[PDB]
């Protein structure tokens, strides 16, 4: 868990923001969006690798 | 209270388990393009001037 | 609590080795009476270093001035 | 599964080729009772080896500590 938390923190800073899913208090309830206060280009295209 | 540096160095390096790092030592670690990325916000919060 | 470095390797009781060395008359003046014996040997090693250093400084001061006028004026005449 | 290396080419009966050496007293304690002559000769060669090495290291120990620093100051005038 220590190395997992370190990774999750470093990789794109998944924790505390800048992530697509919302792990907080889901309790298997729903799926929601995160972030995006204001966008000035358009619908964000998902780039896969 | 005492003058002699012998006991100062000894009692500091005698049993040193954890070695923490100052922050300005951390900032100089990162290059600019990595520094500005918003996975390093803990430093950006303290570069106001 | 100030803790000094270890003392270096030194050949113990050099005073027993060299007799009639001209410092020994003065060296004999020191007195162990009160102290334990290893403290006595340590302090007397220090005192011997001190006495030899005094003698060496005085010998160098005597060695300082050179090429005396009177001695050369008499020897070559 | 020994299957060792062949022994190095060496001269036979070194013990007798030289008349005497103080290793020989300890050396004569070995005796051949059960084994044939050749195997005993090999073991005896190895034991003479051990004795020579013993004396070599015992000599090096003396040489490390063989400077009567006291005989320098005493024996010199």
UniProtKB/Swiss-Prot annotation, chain B:
Localization (cell): Virion; Host nucleus
Domain of life the protein comes from: Viruses
TM spans (from-to): none
Signal peptide coordinates: none
Family classification: Belongs to the herpesviridae major capsid protein family.
Subunit record text: Homomultimer. Makes the hexons and eleven out of twelve pentons. Interacts with triplex proteins 1/TRX1 and 2/TRX2; adjacent capsomers are linked together in groups of three by triplexes, heterotrimeric complexes composed of one molecule of TRX1 and two molecules of TRX2. Interacts with scaffold protein; this interaction allows efficient MCP transport to the host nucleus. Interacts with capsid vertex component 2/CVC2. Interacts with the small capsomere-interacting protein/SCP.
Function, as annotated: Self-assembles to form an icosahedral capsid with a T=16 symmetry, about 200 nm in diameter, and consisting of 150 hexons and 12 pentons (total of 162 capsomers). Hexons form the edges and faces of the capsid and are each composed of six MCP molecules. In contrast, one penton is found at each of the 12 vertices. Eleven of the pentons are MCP pentamers, while the last vertex is occupied by the portal complex.
Name of the protein in question: Major capsid protein
Native source species: Epstein-Barr virus (strain B95-8) (HHV-4)
Full protein segment contained here: 495 to 543 of 1381
UniProtKB/Swiss-Prot annotation, chains C, D:
SS bond partners: none
Cell compartments where the protein resides: Virion; Host nucleus
Function description: Participates in the assembly of the infectious particles by decorating the outer surface of the capsid shell and thus forming a layer between the capsid and the tegument. Complexes composed of the major capsid protein and small capsomere-interacting protein/SCP assemble together in the host cytoplasm and are translocated to the nucleus, where they accumulate and participate in capsid assembly.
Similarity remark: Belongs to the herpesviridae small capsomere-interacting protein family.
Subunit organization: Interacts with the major capsid protein/MCP.
Name of the protein this chain belongs to: Small capsomere-interacting protein
Coverage span on the entire protein: 1 to 77 of 176
């Amino acid at each position: 868990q220590q190395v997992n938390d370190y990774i999750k923190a470093k990789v794109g800073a998944q924790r505390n923001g800048t992530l697509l899913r919302d792990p907080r208090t889901y309790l298997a309830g729903m799926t929601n969006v995160n972030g995006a206060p204001g966008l000035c280009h358009g619908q964000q295209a998902t780039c896969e690798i | 209270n005492h003058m002699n540096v012998l006991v100062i160095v000894d009692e500091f390096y005698d049993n040193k388990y954890a070695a923490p790092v100052t922050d300005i030592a951390l900032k100089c670690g990162l290059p600019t393009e990595d520094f500005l990325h918003p996975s390093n916000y803990d430093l950006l919060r303290l570069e106001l001037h | 609590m100030a803790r000094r470095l270890p003392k270096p390797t030194l050949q113990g009781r050099l005073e027993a080795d060299f007799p009639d060395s001209p410092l020994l008359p003065k060296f004999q003046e020191l007195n162990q009476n009160n102290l334990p014996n290893d403290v006595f040997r340590e302090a007397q090693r220090s005192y011997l270093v001190f006495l030899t250093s005094q003698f060496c400084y005085e010998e160098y001061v005597q060695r300082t001035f050179g090429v005396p006028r009177r001695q050369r004026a008499i020897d070559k005449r």
